[PDB]
């Protein structure tokens, strides 16, 4: 009895999750609009690459 469907999660989606994290912290409304927009395009174009990466964030 499989019941409720169950499946694994793609590591690629994690990068998009970071976009949501960054977008939320951004002020105004325009900032949120493009940050999500470009991430979707990047997600579609790249599909997959790195499970975890650090670039936009500042160490200090």
Swiss-Prot record:
**Biased composition range(s): Basic and acidic residues:** 1-12
Q: Which top-rank group of organisms is this from?
A: Eukaryota
Where in the body, by tissue, does this protein show up?
A: Expressed in seed.
**General function of this protein:** Seed storage protein.
- Name the family: Belongs to the 7S seed storage protein family.
Its name, as the record gives it, is Vicilin Pis v 3.0101
The organism of origin for this protein: Pistacia vera
Q: What is the lineage of its organism?
A: Eukaryota, Viridiplantae, Streptophyta, Embryophyta, Tracheophyta
Q: Which residues of the full protein are shown?
A: 82 to 138 of 545
